[PDB]
Structure 1
């Protein structure tokens, strides 16, 4: 399909992948932080 057009596709796609990673990397931290907050609440519930 012409190597220059293949190089262009590779670039755009890689960028999109890095963007998805950076986004996912921050969603996991937010999820890990949120689950950690819930555990403190649950500990308190065992006390009544």
Structure 2
């Protein structure tokens, strides 16, 4: 609210670092969850494929 040019830059580093970290977390849980759902789906598909071989 009364920052000078120097104080504003320090503020920006802290702030923009903070935002980036928050979005990276969001991205992390979402990628992690999708990765898992794909993993499960691939396993299911591969099992069906085993049954096709087994026939």
* TM-score normalized with structure 1 length: 0.88
Alpha-carbon distance in 2 for matches of 1:44, 1:6: 56
**1:41 alignment counterpart:** 48
Q: Shift in Å at residue 11 of structure 1? A: 0.5
Q: Show CA shifts across 1:18-40 (max 9, x none).
A: 11111011011001000000011
Task: Count how many residue pairs are aligned between Structure 1 and Structure 2.
Answer: 48
- Asked which structure has the greater CA Rg, the reply is 2
CA RMSD of aligned residues (A): 1.2
Secondary structure of the structure 1 residue equivalent to 2:50: helix
Structure 1 segments unaligned to the other structure (5+ residues): none
Q: Shift in Å at residue 47 of structure 1? A: 2.7
**2:35 alignment counterpart:** 28
Deviating 4+ runs (over 3 angstroms)? none
